[PDB]
Amino acid sequence: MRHRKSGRQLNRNSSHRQAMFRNMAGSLVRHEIIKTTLPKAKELRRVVEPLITLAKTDSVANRRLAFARTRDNEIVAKLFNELGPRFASRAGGYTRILKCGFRAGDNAPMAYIELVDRSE
Amino acid sequence: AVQQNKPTRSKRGMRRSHDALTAVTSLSVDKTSGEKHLRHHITADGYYRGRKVIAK
Amino acid sequence: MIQEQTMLNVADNSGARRVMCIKVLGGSHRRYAGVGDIIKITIKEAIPRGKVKKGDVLKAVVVRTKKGVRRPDGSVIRFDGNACVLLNNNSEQPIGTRIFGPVTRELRSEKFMKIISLAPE
Amino acid sequence: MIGLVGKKVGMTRIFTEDGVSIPVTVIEVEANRVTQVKDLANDGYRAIQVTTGAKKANRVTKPEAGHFAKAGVEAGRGLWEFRLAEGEEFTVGQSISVELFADVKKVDVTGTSKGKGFAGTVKRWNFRTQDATHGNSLSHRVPGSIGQNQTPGKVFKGKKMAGQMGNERVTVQSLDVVRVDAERNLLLVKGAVPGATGSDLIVKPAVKA
Amino acid sequence: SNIIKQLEQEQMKQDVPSFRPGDTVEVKVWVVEGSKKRLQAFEGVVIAIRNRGLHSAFTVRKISNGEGVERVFQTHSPVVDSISVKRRGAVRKAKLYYLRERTGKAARIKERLN
RNA sequence: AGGACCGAACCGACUAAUGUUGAAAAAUUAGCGGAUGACUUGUGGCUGGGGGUGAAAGGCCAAUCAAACCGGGAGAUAGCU
RNA sequence: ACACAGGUGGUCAGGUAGAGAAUACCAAGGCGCUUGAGAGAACUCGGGUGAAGGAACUAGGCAAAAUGGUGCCGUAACUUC
RNA sequence: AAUUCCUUGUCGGGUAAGUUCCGACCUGCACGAAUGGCGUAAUGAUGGCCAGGCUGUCUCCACCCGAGACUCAGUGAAAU
RNA sequence: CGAUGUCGGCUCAUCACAUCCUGGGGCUGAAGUAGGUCCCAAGGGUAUGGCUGUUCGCCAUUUAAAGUGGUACGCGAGCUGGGUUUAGAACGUCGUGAGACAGUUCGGUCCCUAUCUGCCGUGGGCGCUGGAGAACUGAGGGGGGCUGCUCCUAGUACGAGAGGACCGGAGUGGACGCAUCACUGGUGUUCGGGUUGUCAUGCCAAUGGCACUGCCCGGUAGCUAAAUGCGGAAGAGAUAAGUGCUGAAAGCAUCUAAGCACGAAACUUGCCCCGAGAUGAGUUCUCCCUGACCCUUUAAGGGUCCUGAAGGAACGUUGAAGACGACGACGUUGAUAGGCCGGGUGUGUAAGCGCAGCGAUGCGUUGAGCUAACCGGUACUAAUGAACCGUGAGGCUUAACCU
Fold first, then answer.
1. Domain residue spans in chain A?
2. In this complex, does chain E touch chain C, defined as having at least 3 beta-carbon pairs under 8 Å apart?
3. Closest residue by Cα to the C1' atom of nucleotide G45?
4. Of the four listed, A89, D167, D178, E83, which is most buried by Cβ atoms within 10 Å?
């Protein structure tokens, strides 16, 4: 059963997931938008916003302790400094999602995960 | 197990009753995109309700 | 605990070391349990000085259940022993003359009086 | 008396001065006013049927709107029959409460069980687990045998194995009246009731124990 | 929920200290022996965690007779009545269950201070 | 020093599990044994079917072994199906 | 028979830890094993953990568990010493 | 007794309770001296048995993490 | 015999009654007491170990009682492989020998993804006659049916005492079921911390990675037992064996022939669940449609135009629902998920900075920081917005009412 459990396995074990999420986190910062499988985006949503919350507040500590949550200088450099004023314009909700249907390798519904404050 | 006996043609088409793809009536129109597009997804020019998501 | 086996402690001067249960009485195939019930015993080790013999079949009362017993609100007194007081087997009387060990209030209730006069806590 | 439909909305245990804290389940009643009626002028029945309200007046249909308005307005996500032959009640809403069970001291409580679904031998039918690694070759949670040989040639109707758990109405009887709070609309019952939180549940008077 | 919160405040009616394990305590509990409102002392070793709101836990090591008990305290039961804090200490773990195994001598722990 | 000990390599196959229309016409995994020798292996060489070889089981001698395989006697013969 | 979880000899033999061609993590260097994507059931497999009891299991403590290193102490029956 | 049919022989030890086991007894169906007899330290992936530690083996099963199963999309069998 | 796998176990049962217990009686050498024996009774229940390959048996200790027998001496396309019986090997024995052994011993591949029947669940059509949406009646079917002890009665009846009930009542358990995490605990790789090795993040520090979750402690929600609650009833109805009245045949007698009365855990109910495909398709309530034409044997329709509704699904967002469908909830007039804020919970004084100590590290800052699956609130994000499917006032017969 999974009654009031949340968190998908996805592909593999948690040990794949934490690498796989850290990649996609940084890729989000790095390039703005990501097109991927619809379940995947709606799972990565849950746990990348916590980088974004830590980063709309100025802290030196929480940056280094927020590098316990990421790795890569660049993305915690973009966060805070460049995606800080992006996300100082609100609390709550740091992506819009929207969707895009099946994939051409096999039929698998895809969605989007992308920043909402630049996406124009 | 390993079956016995030969199923009849009937018995095939009887399972294939339930086999088919759902007719979604896929085409649909927005006032933000009059395209002939599948609803709740891309219009093929990025829109969903307007707003281009695509850069490719 | 378990109807078969277990190695129980002596909470009383007579007998010593490991003391096997062989049937948690009340029967009907009683599964685990025993908290303050009379249970058919066979002592496996006995006190080496003084004699009541080893290998005898006796009865004992479990007064110190390592899983636990409880009431009045279901607040659990969880023992760290597995001990009992050996009892006459044709009767019910303590053979042991001193008892040391905390005991259950379910032995205060009903005819068992002898046990709970000679042990504290 | 009749039982009325509240909803369970948590579970607690409530202390008394004599040192017992019995288990409790806090069913929250909220008005059950008498909407539809079924009478012996219409034969077969002598129930009464009631409401609990509902979140919107847009979440139900035109048929599911009519029947209501022909007995005052109050919403409804449901109606549940409650036989009676005396203890007569009447078609206009009445908004009766826990207040019933302040002269009742037994109750039943008749909600819906939560269920898990899938079912399975051991997990639902409570068979043994064996051949863990002592001669394992599939055998764990298997039903083992299910039948004999050719002198029944078949397996009897209603034989347990696989299927379904719960998602049905259930009751265990009793689940006594502990406190009647007719003004916060709490009903503190004795022990664990039918289903998880959010289940509807009648609370009939037992005379069945 | 809100509806088991209101009820739960209705039953919060103890006013107690704050207990950080490694507490020595002396619990005085209504025995109700034969309708006696005597109160029996239970100096013990707190181990288990309090709170979970209303419902709380504490527990004893007694070492009565070379071995003890554990006795869950609620701090909201009338049976509890009143509970002395006594000596308290510093230890990083919030359980001292290695005191069931490792027993006396290593039962000792550092002091919290004040 | 040792057909010594503990143990990788290497060799070998004691247990169990998984496979058993396999991943595979004998393997895989976790354990296991032996381990400078009565060792082990590469290269090459040598023993031929009523024969070899065999620390010996009727085992092995090309996924075949109480008499190999192939051709031929031969469309053996079969009161048998 | 397959781009087959198998088999296949010699040569080169890096760091740290470690006794080490163990092992763990890294080099140099080369790869992710040619269906993916979901839901996470039952059940099956593969593991991990289990309150209390501790062989009651079973043909049998099979498996697993638990034991394990190094230094130091201390070491019995017996004996072909 | 890896030998003994009757046989769970009989007695003793161990076990709470021991058709096995172990020590004996000798009524050896139908042991026996190089188709070696009786011992035997050491050795053993040896047989059998007991005991300690230890345990999901069991009591008494539960949850979890993975690989399938299940579902989609592509590909696409089998014995019968 | 063109393969019907042996025994035993395990697992899973199910039936029969020639009944072991409970139930109800008869007789009793029926003092009581437990019984003995027999009649009726299958509703329910009906033991673990020790030895042995054996089922069995013997033994040990309970138990209310550990029934008996059948089901391919029940069950291997469910498990096991110990025995018997493969090929190895040996002893004693038999045999000249090779070899042999219902004598014995140690070792020794248990295969198969289910088409169909059957079962346990669960959908998809169509139907139920205008079409729908809900709510039920209850025909039937299934589940469930156990019982000790103690206390009261009453130390009464009985008994020479010792001993010691009946009838009935209460209470507290055992076994079994059912429900549920609130409590007690377990798990909790998805939460927090410690810690071993090493590699990395330029380096230090601090971390992250990897090592069966690296190791290890604690733990949230949920699920769950070892936890906790609850359940097997009373009482009816009609009876069995039985116990009777009244009572002829057969002036009496006679429980039966006429007629009536009680009488069991059986049976019919009462209780709980499934339950109108109950095609005998039931009933109650509500809602939506009350436009034209044309071509026909025409009153039976077929087609065309305009409407297309109520409602459904689809689809999305998801749920203490879930294999998939299904069901449940919501889709901006919104709390439906996630996020956010706050709470709570669990860990246990983060990092950095300052000070002390040569250092390791401590203290202070700071019961700090972190914190999910939870709870409360909050539109921050996505639930976009058309569409689609579904139609268009109801066949005949007859009765009743209405002009």
1. 13-115
2. yes
3. D138
4. E83
To test the contact with chain A by mutation, choose from B41, B48, B49 the residue with the greatest count of A C-beta atoms within 10 A, namely B41
* A1 close contact with D: CB closer than 8 A: yes
- The C-alpha atoms of residue D177 and residue D191 are separated, in whole angstroms, by 10
What is the span of the domain harbouring residue E78?
Answer: 1-114
Number of domains forming the structure of chain B: 1
Dihedral in degrees, nearest 10, Cα atoms C75, C78, C82, C84: -40
Structure tokens at E3: 């509806």
CATH architecture of A13-115: Alpha-Beta Complex (3.90)
Structure token pair of residue E51: 């709170």
From residue A111, alpha-carbon distances to A31, A43, A116, D207, E22 in Å are: 16, 12, 15, 58, 53
Characterise A81 by phi-psi region: left (phi > 0), alpha (psi -120 to 50), beta (else). Answer: alpha
| Cα–Cα distance for residue pair D127/D121, rounded to 1 Å | 6
- Resolution reading in Å: 5.8
Domain residue limits at B3: 1-56
Cβ of residue D136 near strand F, that is under 7 Å?
yes
Is the minimum CB–CB distance between D45 and chain C shorter than 8 Å? no
Question: Per the CB < 8 Å rule, is C72 touching D19?
Answer: yes
CA–CA separation, A44 vs A8, rounded Å? 10
Q: How many domains does chain E have?
A: 1
Q: D165: burial class by Cβ within 10 Å (0-12, 13-18, 19+)?
A: middle
Picking from B38, B40, B53, the nearest residue to A114 by CB comes out as B53
Q: Output DSSP code: residue C51.
A: -
